[PDB]
Design an enzyme around this catalytic site. Structure first.
Site, PDB file in Angstrom:
ATOM      1  CG  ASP A   1     -11.278 -10.967  10.550  1.00 55.99           C
ATOM      2  OD1 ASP A   1     -10.973 -11.520  11.620  1.00 55.99           O
ATOM      3  OD2 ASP A   1     -10.455 -10.691   9.656  1.00 55.99           O
TER       4      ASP A   1
ATOM      5  CB  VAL B   1      -0.950   0.083   1.228  1.00 56.76           C
ATOM      6  CG1 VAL B   1      -2.052   1.101   0.968  1.00 56.76           C
ATOM      7  CG2 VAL B   1      -1.555  -1.271   1.548  1.00 56.76           C
TER       8      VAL B   1
ATOM      9  CE  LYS C   1      -5.583  -4.525   0.258  1.00 57.81           C
ATOM     10  NZ  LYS C   1      -6.867  -4.472   1.062  1.00 57.81           N
TER      11      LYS C   1
END
Length: 350
Positions: free
Chosen positions: A128, A18, A31
């Protein structure tokens, strides 16, 4: 031309998979995703990540600004995703030699929750959440990202059932792969992040290098074990509310133990903050505090602005079944479809 950044002139590379860059047409992050199609599960997840971001629209969720046209739509194995840039993220913030107030913490915790409310309203569990994917700016605004493991409304509730990486923020039901997940899983994860936020106070942890996560087959057992050492083992009642009989016998094998009082772990923090944390970190997802109760909790009285707590107009519906074993041709096609949202002239692969 002598660069890893096969992207238009329009973007001038600067810092550092990135980089920071300038858009003639604001600063931005770019990215580069290498080896897109080497592993078809990681590929699918990268696709999920992009397709969900592309369809979400809220101040508290990071924005995809552009996906660059691949040199060859039939053969590319790399992607360039242009993103809204943020000053930092929670993980890096925690590593930093600074200390926060209870106001900061409260503000960061509130902006996270607001963004996760929107996400849930779009019918997604993030699944997550962790410090690295809580992006943060100097003004304490927060943006969620990294939806590669997220579950849309269309994901089967029993799980896909396929025949046979940090776990510190995973709810017990997720660690136990019980499935039939609710909002509760993200609440747990936010509770874990809350514990690290509270460790940013001088009087709870003296030196920044001592800060760490609250809960640091074999990996799953120590994770459950560490959770039990701090909160105690669960009730027979709460063991019984597990979905699967096999998990019940397994949790009953762990020696019965009392929990420590979390207040004594954060003695500088207010009673409101601890009460909230205790309510986010409960074993039974049925008894765990919901997101909406979180936003209404007295801890946020001074920072709440109920008007930013908006909902999605509709649920995110992906044009593919991401719980299924998609082959490479299906993945390439779907990616290009995503790229067509920014460059609609792009040819589809034949």
């Amino acid at each position: 031309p002598h660069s890893d950044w096969q992207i238009p002139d329009r973007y001038e590379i600067r810092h550092l998979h990135v980089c920071e860059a300038y858009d003639k047409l604001r600063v931005v992050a770019i990215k580069k995703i290498l080896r897109v199609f080497e592993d078809l599960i990681d590929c699918k997840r990268i696709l999920r990540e992009i397709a969900i971001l592309n369809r979400l629209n809220h101040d508290h969720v990071v924005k995809v600004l552009d996906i660059v046209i691949p040199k060859d739509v039939e053969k590319f194995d790399e992607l360039y995703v242009v993103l809204e840039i943020a000053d930092s993220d929670f993980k890096k913030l925690f590593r930093t030699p600074v200390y926060l107030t209870e106001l900061h913490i409260k503000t960061l915790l509130y902006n996270l929750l607001v963004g996760v409310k929107y996400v849930h309203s779009a019918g997604i569990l993030h699944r997550d959440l962790k410090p690295a994917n809580c992006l943060v700016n100097q003004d304490c605004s927060v943006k969620v990202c990294d939806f590669g493991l997220a579950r849309t409304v269309d994901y089967p509730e029993n799980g896909n059932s396929q025949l046979p990486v940090t776990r510190w923020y995973r709810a017990p039901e997720l660690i136990l792969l019980q499935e039939n997940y609710t909002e509760a899983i993200d609440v747990w994860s936010i509770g874990c992040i809350f514990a690290e936020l509270l460790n940013m106070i001088k009087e709870n942890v003296a030196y920044h290098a001592d800060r760490g996560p609250l809960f640091p087959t074999r990996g799953n057992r120590d994770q459950l074990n560490v959770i039990f050492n701090i909160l105690g083992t669960p009730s027979e009642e709460d063991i019984e509310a597990l979905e699967k009989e096999d998990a019940k016998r397994y949790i009953r094998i762990f020696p019965k133990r009392e929990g420590t009082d979390l207040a004594e772990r954060f003695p500088a923090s207010s009673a409101d903050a601890i009460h909230l944390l205790k309510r986010m970190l409960v074993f039974n997802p049925n008894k765990r505090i919901t997101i909406n109760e979180c936003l209404a909790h007295p801890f946020f009285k001074e920072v709440r602005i109920a008007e930013v707590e908006t909902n999605a107009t509709e649920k995110v519906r992906l044009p593919f079944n991401d719980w299924m074993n998609m082959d490479e041709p299906q993945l390439r096609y779907a990616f290009v479809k995503e790229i067509q949202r920014y460059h609609p002239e792009i040819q589809l692969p034949r």
